[PDB]
Design a protein around this ligand. Sequence first.
Ligand SMILES: [Ca+2]
Ligand SMILES: [Cl-]
Length: 240
Amino acid sequence: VVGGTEAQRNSWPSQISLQYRSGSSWAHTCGGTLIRQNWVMTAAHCVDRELTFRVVVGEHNLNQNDGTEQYVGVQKIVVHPYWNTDDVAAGYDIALLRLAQSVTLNSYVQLGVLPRAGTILANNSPCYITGWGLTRTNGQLAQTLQQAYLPTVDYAICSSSSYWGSTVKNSMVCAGGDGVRSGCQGDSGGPLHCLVNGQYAVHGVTSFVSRLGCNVTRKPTVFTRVSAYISWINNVIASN
Ligand SMILES: [Ca+2]
Ligand SMILES: [Cl-]
């Protein structure tokens, strides 16, 4: 997250860190949203690589013991069947990870609330992106979980020529584009939390930013629209 602030430890308890095994260690690669005690919602693109993945819930600082982390293997990966790694603009950038164990819920570990199917946010709706992604274009991952206030940019604006044009689909949520604040690499798969009727819900799964850079004016961060996938999600969970 570019232009973020450090999240309070218990603000976003459904945020997870999706990590891959690298040597004798683990590296954060993506965010995710805990949606059941044994299921994480993330971006399909986060799991195109044939890596060993684990999920960390209750994580705050990737570089320090927080005393709240639970580490769990990824047991099964269910990528949306229409995902095509060579065409992120087509959408379907969503995947569910069944965790090898059910995590224990507490103030640091909670299920993300998802919007009802079909819900579309009015333009300029208040949301925060959260994640450990780069803090600058071509920068480095955050140590501490970051949040940035990224108001939505509706489809009509987002899919306009000076924004994302045809690249953005109605199955996506755009947010931000102010040139200051944005998602950035390593935020992928994580939530966009939007305040609706007093409650934050995870409306987006971070999907992409401009190849030119993270915080590029009129290139808001683009998220998979969670409310486009509620049936899919429920179908997956019910069949697994
Ligand atoms: Ca930690
Ligand atoms: Cl949360």
